[PDB]
Design a binder for this molecule. Structure first.
Ligand code: I05
Lengths: 341, 20
């Protein structure tokens, strides 16, 4: 009967998504309404900055993408997907999208500012996570992937660098730049080398299952302190993944080893998450035996770590990047290309 | 150790995506 309670939730959930998916939100703000403070990260065609909405006083994090740059690398459909999906979704562990707009040069997504830093930064600092601590994060990624997949969405870029810690010590998934709504197979060669399912590497066409594979790679980086497949150039990392030969740290509990052994399965018809029981095979595993899946959805569990921050607009849990002025050119660039944004 | 090899590796820094 708890299984039926989720079924209902994700049915009402998918009704919401479709109303926003079919009729998406446009030009709900402007560049001049935001005072730009500091850069929080970057990417191939832009950056994310801390900002202040001058009329509400509130802080947000604003992604800024160069329209011309996106076209040069042929990445239009991806950038359009990010916004469409982000504006559509709604979940305790997904960064919100508050505003979006475009001007002559760039695309702009203003998201709720998550001041805790990226998991990545913390994990590198501390070294590695206690399994209980890594169970707390993993379980929020399970629920979120149970959510996304039921809207027929594949995430494709899970890794510590895109998992943000909020003030209550939980996760906001960011970077939906390779998210794609697909029923059936897709064949795009994208992701981060250390998180790619072998099927992707092998140009096979693939599905939701790659997200279960990444969840295992992620948990293993959380608990070991380093990924299961690594080296000094991608091509050497690719060979390790298809080889299908993992090796576990000696501290890893035996339940962790059996979980990972089942998510890091090369054979797609054996991987947890692509089987007849679905996601429940994961939820019902012994490593997750102490996990109250509903306390976690409801955010009533005690986070094993809360990041320190001394007032709003504090950027102290984030690295320092070189700054750059924002040139908005006098002529519209790529208007037709991004006309749905 | 394997922790040690990782720490010395080119890939302990934030990792970019690849794409088409
Ligand atoms: C095809 O490639 C794509 C697709 C979509 C995209 O938006 C992009 C980007 O160009 C792009 C630009 C800047 C970033 C910066 O992202 C920061 C730092 C990198 C790691 N992910 C975390 C992210 N931080 C946040 O989004 C954030 C949000 C709210 N509060 C704090 C941080 C990411 C992608 C992109 F390169």
């Amino acid at each position: 009967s708890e299984q039926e309670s989720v079924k209902e939730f994700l049915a009402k959930a998918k009704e919401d998504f479709l109303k926003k998916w079919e009729n998406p939100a446009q030009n709900t703000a402007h560049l001049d309404q935001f005072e730009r403070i500091k850069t929080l990260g970057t990417g191939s065609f832009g950056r994310v900055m801390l900002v202040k909405h001058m009329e509400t006083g509130n802080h947000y994090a604003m992604k800024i993408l160069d329209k011309q740059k996106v076209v040069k690398l042929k990445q239009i459909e991806h950038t359009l997907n990010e916004k469409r999906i982000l504006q559509a979704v709604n979940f305790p562990f997904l960064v919100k999208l508050e505003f979006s707009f475009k001007d002559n040069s760039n695309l702009y997504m203003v998201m709720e500012y998550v001041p805790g830093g990226e998991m990545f930064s913390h994990l590198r600092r501390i070294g590695r996570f206690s399994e209980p601590h890594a169970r707390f994060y993993a379980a929020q990624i399970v629920l979120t992937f149970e959510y996304l997949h039921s809207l027929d969405l594949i995430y494709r870029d899970l890794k510590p660098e895109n998992l943000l810690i909020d003030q209550q010590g939980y996760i906001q998934v960011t970077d939906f730049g390779f998210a794609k709504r697909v029923k059936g197979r897709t064949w795009t060669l994208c992701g981060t080398p250390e998180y790619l399912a072998p099927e992707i590497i092998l140009s096979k066409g693939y599905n939701k299952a790659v997200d279960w594979w990444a969840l295992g790679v992620l948990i293993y980086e959380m608990a070991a302190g380093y990924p299961p497949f690594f080296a000094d150039q991608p091509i050497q990392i690719y060979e390790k993944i298809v080889s299908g030969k993992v090796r576990f740290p000696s501290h890893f509990s035996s339940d962790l080893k059996d979980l990972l052994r089942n998510l890091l399965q090369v054979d797609l018809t054996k991987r947890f998450g692509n089987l007849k029981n679905g996601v429940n095979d994961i939820k019902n595993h012994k490593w997750f035996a102490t996990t109250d899946w509903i306390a976690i959805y409801q955010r009533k569990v005690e986070a094993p770590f809360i990041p320190k921050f001394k007032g709003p607009g504090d950027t102290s849990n984030f690295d320092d990047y070189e700054e750059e002025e924002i040139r908005v050119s006098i002529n519209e660039k790529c208007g037709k290309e991004f006309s749905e944004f | 150790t394997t922790y040690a090899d990782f720490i010395a590796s080119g890939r302990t820094g934030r990792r970019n995506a690849i794409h088409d």
